[PDB]
């Protein structure tokens, strides 16, 4: 299983399935990590921060204080910055957020109506919608979309530096570039929006400023890339299966549909942990110091939990999929992302546009965060 091989990138799920069917916890000797594809095993590891951590300092790896961030901190340090970010999120009025997200989606769909040629939904919809969405939520002016995507893409590709080490350095430069962007916003941002709220919250709580800046960069980059890649994958499915949008289109029906779309097309393919204390996982004894890569997109296709796992089924139990993670590090923006995809579905139905394939979905060589390079369609 070469995660960056073109045939794997074209469609990794059959390879995930072959892995899962042979062993839910495989040792990958060249990557020096456990590969976890079973739902039960991924759910176990995500929720157990006592024996599996995200802060490599807990296995005696040197991490400078200037690089600490909400994603790479474990209790008790994680709680302070986590609560700070959640408090800032909860201060945002949802009526305004939903109005902004709905208008952004409608505007970009309207620009596509009347296009007689082939249009790429990645560059023309998924990315620009995601960029304006996250910056509206943050309360900051959107940067140039093409330029921001270029810097952001370097960070995405750096998530695979364990496979291709040359990807690490461009990612570090890009992280520094986005950090200066966040630093400018912290200094100048209006009181309206998430940045203003996080700034207010930080004054009270006491968080290292470096953690706050690094954590705000995570909110920006996670918000942009996760939403962008989710929208692309969902659109890829809808263009091939337009019947998915021909359903009842009630609040409750779309709840089930959105849940299935996130389960199937959630872009996070891999979510890593380090073992802090020996613990059985699947058939294996995982040892302190071991790395585990949780293939959560594979876990969302485990047939023991999701029968007919590759299909949208509107009658599944809610709250099962792992596309937002689980436990202490569960996605801060899970509610924003579901609200956003809901509005996208609603804008598509009100737009009355039919989106037929004008060529194959083409996938970028990124293994940790799945993303389309191009999604060519005709608009009628």
């Amino acid at each position: 299983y070469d995660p960056l091989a073109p045939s794997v990138i074209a469609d990794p799920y059959p390879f995930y399935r072959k892995l899962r069917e042979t062993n839910t916890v495989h040792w990958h000797e060249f990557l020096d990590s456990w590969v976890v594809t079973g739902y039960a095993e991924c759910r176990q590891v995500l929720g157990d921060t006592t024996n599996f951590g995200s802060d490599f300092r807990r296995i005696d790896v040197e991490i400078p204080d200037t690089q600490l961030s909400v994603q790479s901190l474990d209790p008790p340090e994680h709680g302070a910055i986590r609560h700070l970010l959640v408090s800032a999120l909860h201060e945002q009025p949802l009526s305004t957020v939903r109005q902004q997200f709905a208008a952004i989606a409608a505007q970009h769909l309207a620009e596509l109506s009347g296009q007689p040629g082939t249009v790429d939904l990645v560059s023309r919809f998924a990315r620009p919608v995601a960029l304006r969405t996250i910056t509206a939520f943050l309360g900051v002016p959107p940067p140039d979309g093409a330029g921001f995507e270029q810097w952001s893409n370097a960070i995405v590709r750096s998530m695979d530096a364990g496979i291709e080490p040359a990807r690490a350095e461009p990612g570090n430069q890009a992280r520094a570039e986005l950090s200066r962007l966040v630093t400018h916003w912290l200094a100048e941002a209006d009181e309206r929006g998430f940045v203003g709220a996080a700034r207010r919250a930080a004054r009270a709580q006491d968080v290292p400023a470096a953690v706050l800046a690094n954590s705000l960069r995570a909110v920006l980059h996670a918000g942009y890339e996760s939403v962008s890649r989710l929208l692309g994958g969902v659109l890829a499915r809808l263009v091939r299966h337009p019947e998915l949008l021909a359903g009842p289109a009630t609040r409750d029906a779309d709840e089930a549909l959105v849940d299935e779309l996130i389960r199937l097309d959630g872009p996070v393919q891999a979510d890593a942990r380090v073992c802090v204390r020996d613990q059985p996982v699947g058939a294996q004894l995982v040892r302190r110091g071991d790395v585990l890569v949780l293939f959560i997109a594979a876990a969302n296709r485990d047939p023991a939990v999701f029968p007919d796992p590759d299909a949208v089924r509107l009658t599944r139990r809610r709250g099962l999929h792992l596309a937002f993670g689980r436990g202490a590090h569960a996605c801060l923006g899970a509610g924003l992302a579901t609200l956003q995809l809901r509005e996208v579905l609603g804008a598509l139905r009100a737009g009355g546009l039919r989106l037929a394939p004008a060529g194959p979905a083409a996938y970028e060589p990124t293994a940790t965060l799945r993303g389309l390079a191009e999604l060519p369609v005709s608009v009628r």
Binding site: M159, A270, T368
Partner: peptide, 5 residues
């Protein structure tokens, strides 16, 4: 492979 922004 690490989902780290």
């Amino acid at each position: 492979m690490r989902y780290l922004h």
